[PDB]
C-alpha cells in the first residue's frame, strides 16, 4: 500500500544511480502525498531537474528547492507551506527521509536524506519515508559534499517518479 518513489541522480550531468524510497502514507499521509506528487510532477511542478544544495558527510543530503535551487525556496502541493502533520517517526539513522523547515508548520518541498542518526531533529522535523534501494547511491552523493554543505559537483535529480 505504501507508495514507492524513485530519483535518478546525476553528477555534473553524468548518471550516478537510482535511489528508491518507501513513503509512510500509513503514518504521515499528507506529508507523504506532497513528496509523491512532487516526484511525479502531477501538479505541474516538482523535483525533476532539481538539485541537492546542501550535502554534509556524516549528517545529511538536503534537496527539494526547485524554485531557487539554494535552500531559500520550494513550495508544497497544498500552498506555500503546510503544518507539521505528526512526529510519530524518529530520525533513527541513515536512510531516513524527513522534511526541512524554517520553524513550526513551515513544510514546503525541501527534504533531507539522513546519512547518520539525527535524534536532535526528533519532534521538530516530520519523518515520512526511508531509502528502500540505493542507499549506496546516497553514500556516493555524500562524497561530493563538504563540512559547510557546498557540493564539489552538481548533484541533480535527472528524473523522478512513482514505481510499481
Amino acid at each position: 500500500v505504501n507508495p514507492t518513489v524513485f530519483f535518478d541522480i546525476a553528477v555534473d550531468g553524468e548518471p550516478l544511480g537510482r535511489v528508491s524510497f518507501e513513503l509512510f502514507a500509513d503514518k504521515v499521509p499528507k506529508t507523504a502525498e506532497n513528496f509523491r506528487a512532487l516526484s511525479t510532477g502531477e501538479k505541474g511542478f516538482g523535483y525533476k531537474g532539481s538539485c541537492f544544495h546542501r550535502i554534509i558527510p556524516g549528517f545529511m543530503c538536503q534537496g527539494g528547492d526547485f524554485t531557487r535551487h539554494n535552500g531559500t525556496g520550494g513550495k508544497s502541493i497544498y500552498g506555500e507551506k503546510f503544518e507539521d502533520e505528526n512526529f510519530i517517526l524518529k530520525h533513527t539513522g541513515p536512510g531516513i527521509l524527513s522534511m526541512a523547515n524554517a520553524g513550526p508548520n513551515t513544510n514546503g518541498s525541501q527534504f533531507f536524506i539522513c546519512t547518520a542518526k539525527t535524534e536532535w531533529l526528533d519532534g521538530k522535523h516530520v519523518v515520512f519515508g526511508k531509502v528502500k534501494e540505493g542507499m549506496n547511491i546516497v553514500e556516493a552523493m555524500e562524497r561530493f559534499g563538504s563540512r559547510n554543505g557546498k557540493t564539489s559537483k552538481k548533484i541533480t535529480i535527472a528524473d523522478c517518479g512513482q514505481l510499481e
Binding site: 554534509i56 528547492d65 525556496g73 523547515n101 513551515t106
Partner: peptide
Amino acid sequence: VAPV
C-alpha cells in the same frame, strides 16, 4: 542543517 535541515532549515529553509
